[PDB]
């Protein structure tokens, strides 16, 4: 079957979503709740990346324009991964997928507002978490 295929067309960005699936095992054999559980654990991935490498950057003694921006993305981030993301998970693994949309708008949101406070150097994995977080909300939205 080609469920993760079809799911991944009706998503922002098919080959992304594509290749974010299937790099799970659970990919062969899941239903598309599974697959959204797949992509909010590779959102998790990128935002704890994202989560050390600020930390690493202020335990450095970073340059002075970038320790407020540093301070508010530890929060971003903080939030993506306390509050954000088990909200998504718990939605999910309880069948109320429409908290999991929510958590998934706002990790987007947050990934996107901490780039904002700065290019970042860390560009690439805000970008990453907006990326799968705005696929990931386009999943969840066929379960509804």
């Given at each position: 079957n080609n469920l993760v295929e079809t799911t991944c067309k009706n998503t922002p960005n098919y080959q992304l979503c594509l290749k974010t699936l299937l790099s799970?095992?659970?990919?062969?054999?899941?239903?598309i709740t599974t697959l959204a559980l797949i992509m909010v654990d590779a959102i998790k991935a990128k935002a704890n990346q994202a989560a050390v490498t600020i930390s690493k950057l202020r335990h450095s003694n970073p340059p002075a324009a970038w320790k407020g921006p540093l301070k508010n993305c530890a929060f971003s981030y903080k939030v993506i991964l306390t509050a954000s993301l088990p909200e998504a998970i718990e939605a999910l693994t309880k069948g109320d997928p429409k908290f999991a949309e929510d958590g998934m708008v706002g990790s987007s949101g947050d990934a996107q507002e901490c780039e904002e406070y700065?290019?970042?150097?860390?560009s690439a994995l805000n970008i990453a978490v907006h990326e799968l977080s705005d696929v990931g909300r386009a999943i969840v939205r066929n379960l509804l």
């Amino acid at each position: 079957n080609n469920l993760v295929e079809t799911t991944c067309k009706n998503t922002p960005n098919y080959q992304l979503c594509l290749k974010t699936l299937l790099s799970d095992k659970r990919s062969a054999t899941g239903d598309i709740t599974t697959l959204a559980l797949i992509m909010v654990d590779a959102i998790k991935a990128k935002a704890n990346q994202a989560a050390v490498t600020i930390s690493k950057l202020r335990h450095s003694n970073p340059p002075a324009a970038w320790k407020g921006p540093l301070k508010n993305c530890a929060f971003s981030y903080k939030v993506i991964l306390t509050a954000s993301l088990p909200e998504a998970i718990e939605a999910l693994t309880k069948g109320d997928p429409k908290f999991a949309e929510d958590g998934m708008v706002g990790s987007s949101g947050d990934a996107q507002e901490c780039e904002e406070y700065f290019k970042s150097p860390f560009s690439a994995l805000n970008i990453a978490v907006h990326e799968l977080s705005d696929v990931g909300r386009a999943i969840v939205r066929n379960l509804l």
